[PDB]
Amino acid sequence: TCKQCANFFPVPKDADDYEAGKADCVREKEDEKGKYWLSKPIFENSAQCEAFQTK
Amino acid sequence: TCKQCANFFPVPKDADDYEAGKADCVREKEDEKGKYWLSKPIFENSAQCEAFQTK
Amino acid sequence: QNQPHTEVGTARPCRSCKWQTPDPTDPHRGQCTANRHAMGGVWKRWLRDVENTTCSRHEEGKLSFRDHV
Amino acid sequence: NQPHTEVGTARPCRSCKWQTPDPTDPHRGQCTANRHAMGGVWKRWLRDVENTTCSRHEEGKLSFRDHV
Amino acid sequence: KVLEYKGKKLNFTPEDPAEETIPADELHEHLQKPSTARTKRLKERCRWKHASAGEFIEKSVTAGIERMRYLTEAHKASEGKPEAIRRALGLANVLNKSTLVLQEDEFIVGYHAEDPNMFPLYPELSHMAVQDYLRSDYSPQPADEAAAINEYWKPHSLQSKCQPYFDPADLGRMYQVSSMEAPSFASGYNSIVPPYETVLEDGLLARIKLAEKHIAEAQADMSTFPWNGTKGLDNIAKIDNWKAMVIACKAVISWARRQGRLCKIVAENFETDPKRQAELLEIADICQRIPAEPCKGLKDAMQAKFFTFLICHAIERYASGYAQKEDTLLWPYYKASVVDKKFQPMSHMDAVELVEMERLKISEHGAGKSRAYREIFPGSNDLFILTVGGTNAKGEDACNDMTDAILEAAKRIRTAEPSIVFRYSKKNREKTLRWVFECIRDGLGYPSIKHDEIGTEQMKEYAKFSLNGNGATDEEAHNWVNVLCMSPGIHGRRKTQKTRSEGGGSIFPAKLLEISLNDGYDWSYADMQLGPKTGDLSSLKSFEDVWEAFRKQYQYAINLCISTKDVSRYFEQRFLQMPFVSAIDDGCMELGMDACALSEQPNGWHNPITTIVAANSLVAIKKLVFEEKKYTLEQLSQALKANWEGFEEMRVDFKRAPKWGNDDDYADGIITRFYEEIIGGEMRKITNYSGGPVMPTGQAVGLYMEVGSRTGPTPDGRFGGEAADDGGISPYMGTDKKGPTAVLRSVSKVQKNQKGNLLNQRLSVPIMRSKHGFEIWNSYIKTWHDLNIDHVQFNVVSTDEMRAAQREPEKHHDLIVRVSGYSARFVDIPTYGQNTIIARQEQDFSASDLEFLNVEI
Amino acid sequence: KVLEYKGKKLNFTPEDPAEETIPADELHEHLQKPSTARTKRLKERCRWKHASAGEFIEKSVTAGIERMRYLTEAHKASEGKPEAIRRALGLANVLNKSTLVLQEDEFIVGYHAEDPNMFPLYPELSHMAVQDYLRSDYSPQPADEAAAINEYWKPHSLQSKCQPYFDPADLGRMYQVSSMEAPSFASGYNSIVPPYETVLEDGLLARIKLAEKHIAEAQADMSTFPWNGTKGLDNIAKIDNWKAMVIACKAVISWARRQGRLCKIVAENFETDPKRQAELLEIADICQRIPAEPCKGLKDAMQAKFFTFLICHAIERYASGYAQKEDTLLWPYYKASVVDKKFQPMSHMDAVELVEMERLKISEHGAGKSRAYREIFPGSNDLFILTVGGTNAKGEDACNDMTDAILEAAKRIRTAEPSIVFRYSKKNREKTLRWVFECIRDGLGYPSIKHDEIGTEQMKEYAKFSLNGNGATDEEAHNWVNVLCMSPGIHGRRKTQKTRSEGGGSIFPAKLLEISLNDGYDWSYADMQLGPKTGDLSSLKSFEDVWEAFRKQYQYAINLCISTKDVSRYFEQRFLQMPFVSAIDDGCMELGMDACALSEQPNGWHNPITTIVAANSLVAIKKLVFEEKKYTLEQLSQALKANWEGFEEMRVDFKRAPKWGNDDDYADGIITRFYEEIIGGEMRKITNYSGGPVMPTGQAVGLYMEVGSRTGPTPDGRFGGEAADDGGISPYMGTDKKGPTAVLRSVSKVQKNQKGNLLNQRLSVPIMRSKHGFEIWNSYIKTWHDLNIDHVQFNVVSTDEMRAAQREPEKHHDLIVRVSGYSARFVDIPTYGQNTIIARQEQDFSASDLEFLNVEI
Ligand SMILES: O=C(O)/C=C/C(=O)O
Ligand SMILES: O=C(O)/C=C/C(=O)O
Ligand code: SF4
Ligand code: SF4
Ligand code: SF4
Ligand code: SF4
């Protein structure tokens, strides 16, 4: 799981930090101040989170 | 239950290595070559072994 | 009386008093800011123990930043 | 008759009586099976004692008198 | 007002006539003018993380945990490896596994925590600081994991390594922050002057290639016959250091590129505005090429500056400050982008908007410092102090259009941080001076003015003590910036200051005076022996005896102050290596040494805070107790122990005694000796790790309020818990009645053994907003420069505006005041500090004042 | 036989007439004469732990676990502390939690393992050695805990610290032990010369008081105003070292006193014999006062010596050897006890019995060394080499009654270890000389003879290179002992060698010549490139080309050897501190430095083993290949690849080429150039950690067997796997055909660029065991001294007794033979080594031989 999320962007092959199956989990978040985005390194085989949107 | 063994010799209070309840467990052994003695530091409340001599 | 005294395991510690702020270096210590002169001075007292200390002026709560130094 | 690589051989160089562990790295070995008639023990080095075997493999261990 | 000057009638009416229709108690709410709509939105949406009284102003600010977790993981995995390589691996793990943040309307991107409302923590520096964070309402979560991290790091923490070499009584005295500031190893507080120039010119790929070339050469030397054991073993530490640099630099490049990748992803998948998408793609390409490659334009330079700041001040290690020569550092890229339009072509206002965005990004930088330093900078995130202006190597004016862009952005956006320091020279052009005055007349409190020639001569003097003989050259000596608030230091590709252990930290004369009058026993705060037993009251028979008692107290305290710093440096270079900072330093790269081990330019100093309170107390003791025998020392001690209760007449007598800043010959005579013979003279005898002297950089920076609360009543007439003097050479509150020129002449008298002193002055608002004021301000600066005073800073805020702000904070949120050494949002300062700021005399100028100042209207 | 000398008739009939009634094949089984019944009982029940072929001879010998267990615990608990204090804490934990052993009939008590049949292991040195032990039949138990201990220690092991700084190919070449001995960091092998004098003179309580005084002075200096950062930080490492010294010394005192308490307990609760009870009480009181207090008598001195040896060679760290000037060190206490009868009154026979008991205790000392060093000392526990004789500081004879007591105990009790070295001078009295000849004529192999003047001049020359200018004085230079087998080094309270990293390790010229003839590729053993590609055979057009190829190989190898040793020392002083050794060294205590950091007396050296095989091969190559052009280099290489199969005529031709030890002008000229120009010449170019030169100490020590088995066929006439020469300068076995005097002249020709060269000679049994033995042996030694030869050692055994011992091993248990630098029980030597020893030429003295020696009957 945690692979067909709309927030799952596989790391390009040419990237300095590329590993087999690694990806960025990029979300969009918003509080009273503004709207921001969070990019955390995850892998293709990883646990999904509460909000899974199918790609 | 390691206190009333006949091989339990309390460390003197004046000794450099004295601690509360510390003692020497001195046993005698013998093999084909000769007879020797072994002194291991143990404590008053400690696990007993197979060779517990009463009193 | 109004000055701090030692009470072992007190129900009203300096830690929960609104007049106290933790020490700038050691969180086990404290600063008692309950001696507020009429001319604005905050005559702090040092607290060696914030868990077993109390005085008559103990008030549970927490002051806003405006009321501290 | 020469040593060869055999993955997971049933008789490794480790258990052969002609072998003694390398003086520095126990993963390596010394094959002492080439004993000249004039007394020389012409040892050969073994990179791997776990996946190596030859025809002269004999399970056991010589006494120290038979080693160098 | 109206001033009669040489026959002319000077009318003090605001330049902008519409200011006559704005009420005086809300003026500063109508001065901000963001250059573009984007910077206005950013100022409105800004995530301020100001701290005061030891807690954070906003309930949304909370500590992060990602840095602690990943550093702990890397440290557990790197056991047995060289400590420098272990530190490089820790930074690499943090950078590789950290969450990156991108906010709306941002152009300069990047953050130092996993969430825009958070800040990182540092369990490797001081375990007591993390422990205080755990007991706080803004603790990292989950709490049990953070507690396990702190328990794991405690035996390896810098505090645990430094503490075994000092008397526990000494450390107990220090940690109270009453007579001496706590050592940096106990708190984790720090500063740094990063060599941005190397990053902007060379790019990290070049540094990696250089380190690899050095590594290969060293290994070949190690394999060269015939081997020499007395020389070859030197290569081991060099190879360890260079491998650490390679690891750290590769990690930083990967980190910046992952940030750029996040930009591209948000452009292609999350953002709807095509203009915003194009901007995000541009930023993504920038972060792709920067900082791996050299900078080609101004946007490249600013992004590289921000990345380097994040690594050097937040990620690799905590370090307060924003030290940099921003205009000189950015000028080549301004000329490439704005003047020549060769790469990243922009206009001057584009650069103004860029500097605005930089100021806002700094305004969003929460500092994960300890409680002590969440107390002593009220109304601000942290200390962020940049330097502009000055002179170049050939002694010519260094002002340029980039200086004007920085000053215009700071005037427009009205943000407290970062504060600005302007090195003033007579060579400085008048247009930039008009911009500096524009910032000052608006009440921002910055730029503070520093004497350029004094700083350059100081740099030259310190360079002589260099251990390897590679101190700053006479040409390099002109390139200096303030390290944190007040102390000059070299900026450039080499020889910059790398740690607060080199210079920094404070000592408080007021508490020392109080305990000198009590045989070294602090009865007022801790009820404990705080100093040596200099003598009981019966032993202090003459004034010279009190003088010598204070001298003994000062010697003991300052010795502990400098020795703790030098021990901290000893253990920093061995266990707290900064391979990234070492990689971007030409000296560290050439010599294969850690940034803390190598020290080519000495800059040792310590800050005397609350000096003027002790000085005025000494003057009053000499006047009334000894010379006139009006009161005995025992009477004074009885009254002080009573907090002047029932001794009010005596308290007023001591208060009205001659004070500093009135051009009084009696007070100034004693106080100049106090500054040069004791404060500077005794501290000068100490030598630091770099082989240079340690000289006083007087300042207060908020401690004057905290120390005063911990200090008891003083012969100066202060009650117990009353605030101390605002600035190191500044006159005490409501003690100056002779006007601004008299204060200047008193400050002029002390010229010996001081590396720096801070003067805080409050100027009249009507004169400043009047057309006449720039000429008066320029005249004051010119007189101050001829006076040879080291520094001056100006606050121009009506008490009415401040009183209204106290009553209605939400209405007055825009207003900014200056505390000593930095500027703060008034509504975020506690009432104690607000009242110390209000009580500062608003100086009015007479005819004789202008005549002394040589004003030509 | 009967030899006629200058008209007088010399008949070689045994002194002891009963020797005519003892058959020749069992002689040495009837020579032991223990002085008392107690030492006889100890000799019969002795727990020998002899080793051969990499394994232990007896199945009762097995590894211990207590040392690994408690060292691991202490190391896990001491994280974050200074490494020296961590090492002191590890030693303290081992000493406090160890099982102490007391055996029957013992007077000198003490052990280094939890069981009298066991030995400790060293997971902190080399993880590969512990892994080899785990795979062995003598593995520590429980096995899983020992494996977990090794897994914990691997990242922190010294091997893991040294290996990252060398090409893995280079280290792979070293680790084969074929052309270069493996570096000490890879094996854990080590040596030391303990400063027993400090322990025996001062007692550890004095050292503790001294260290505490130094600590207090350093801390007070650190708190002295004004602080100096360039000087005060030097106190941190000194305070750490002195605190480590206090910890280690208190632990050792407590450990010795607990041993004495075990003695008293066994006396009061387990022993029935009242004589034994009184003896145990005496030993208990000794262990109470010793080594806490200074020694007062001979028994005190011996118990203290043995305790210090246990700590310095087994417990705190592994260290081979028994280095000490035993007679000089023990003489004051012998004079106090035996001569003056002031404390512990004894007779001379009592001291003889004491030294007997000491020799038996050393015979019971199992060495937990790695497999490589369980291979190369066949027939012995380890290397134990003490030195007696020599000259004092004034140059006068150092022989005394204690020397004769030591030699007499070695004569009656027939134990292989410890071996004895006798520094010979013309000043040496004739009474001691006969005691020396008494030992040699019995075939014990020891005492070996060393040139006193050469060693003293060597100490002066090395002292000139001392980095801190504290080299040995001309008076101190007379006090020197052999470190292990052959290398001189200073003994005393200061400047003694503390680690093998200073000097030691081997390099093998025979394998180097083989790979010189094969472009650096070892086809015979590993089928791998073992050295640089110096050139193919067609490129070696001249003999000088072969010479230069060998020189390049030798340079590569020797550079690797010395660099590995120096890197090992760097990491030893940083992570393997020895605070106990530092405490008993006056220099380390005075300077507050670790024993591995300070090096006041340089002693760098390396051992060329298998030199004569390469030298004879070069002589044969020049003879037949180039000068006579009888064979081409390609023919010779083809023969070598065929192991001389079908090339027997060529093999005999190369064997019949001129060889070393026959006084051949051609061979000796080439070989002397080989010794002085290459073996010594290239090595001295290299400078070690201490700043001194590195000089060759030629010796074989059994390695000759192993390296010969790993070396392929050589142009000297060897088949593949045949053993090499038995000494540094000895002629190859069976190649000397001109008598002993020719061997002497040949050996004497080499005089330049050597630190030492081992000479093995076999003398005829009837001549040595006759009443004429002493005169002939003394004339031999006198001529050998006048010929300026570095060393000589003798074997007095007939081939028949050795063959009988090979056939009937269970009936020749007391046969002792000499291998190279050490003596072994013949029956514990593998058949390979036994046959190499048998093949040594038994020399006989002609009339002209005695005439050359100036023999006067
Ligand atoms: O680092 C400090 O304590 C101060 C620095 C400054 O004011 O420059
Ligand atoms: O340690 C060695 O290799 C040799 C030592 C000696 O012969 O003294
Ligand atoms: S962590 Fe959640 S948001 Fe991120 S990729 Fe997995 S399921 Fe999607
Ligand atoms: S360990 Fe065993 S023998 Fe020793 S005292 Fe305890 S029970 Fe007795
Ligand atoms: S309980 Fe009393 S002493 Fe403690 S903080 Fe509150 S007011 Fe101060
Ligand atoms: S299996 Fe063959 S190659 Fe391996 S050790 Fe035995 S004889 Fe040697």
Residue numbers in the entry:
A (entry chain F), B (entry chain C): 5 to 59
C (entry chain E): 13 to 81
D (entry chain B): 14 to 81
E (entry chain D), F (entry chain A): 9 to 865
Please give the exact wording used by the authors of the publication that reports this structure.
X-succinate synthases (XSSs) are a class of glycyl radical enzymes (GREs) that enable anaerobic hydrocarbon functionalization, granting anaerobes access to petroleum-derived substrates for metabolism. The most well-studied XSS, benzylsuccinate synthase (BSS), includes two [4Fe–4S] cluster-binding accessory subunits, BSSγ and BSSβ.
The structure of BSS­(αβγ)2 has been previously solved; however, in all reported structures, the N-terminus, C-terminus, and [4Fe–4S] cluster of the γ subunit are unresolved. , We modified the protein purification protocol and used previously established crystallization conditions to obtain a structure of the full BSS­(αβγ)2 complex to 2.9 Å resolution. Notably, our purification approach allowed us to resolve the majority of the BSSγ subunit (residues 5–59 out of 60), and we observed clear density for the [4Fe–4S] cluster known to bind this subunit. , Based on prior modeling and cyclic voltammetry experiments, BSSγ was proposed to adopt a high potential iron-sulfur protein (HiPIP) fold; our structure confirms this proposed architecture (overlay of β and γ). We also observe clear density for BSSβ (residues 13–81 out of 81) and its associated [4Fe–4S] cluster. It has previously been proposed that a loop within BSSβ controls hydrocarbon access to the active site while the C-terminus controls conformational changes of the GRD that could be associated with formation of the thiyl radical and/or activation by AE. ,, The catalytic BSSα subunit adopts the characteristic 10-stranded β/α-barrel and exhibits high structural similarity to previously reported structures (R.M.S.D. = 0.183, residues 9–865 out of 865). In the active site, both toluene and fumarate were modeled and align well with prior structures; however, only fumarate was intentionally included in the crystallization conditions. The remaining electron density in the toluene-binding pocket was too large to model as water, and toluene provided the best fit. Structurally, BSSγ resembles BSSβ (blue), with both adopting HiPIP-like folds. The C-terminus of BSSβ is the only region that directly contacts the glycyl radical domain (GRD), suggesting a potential role in modulating conformational dynamics of the GRD and thus thiyl radical formation.
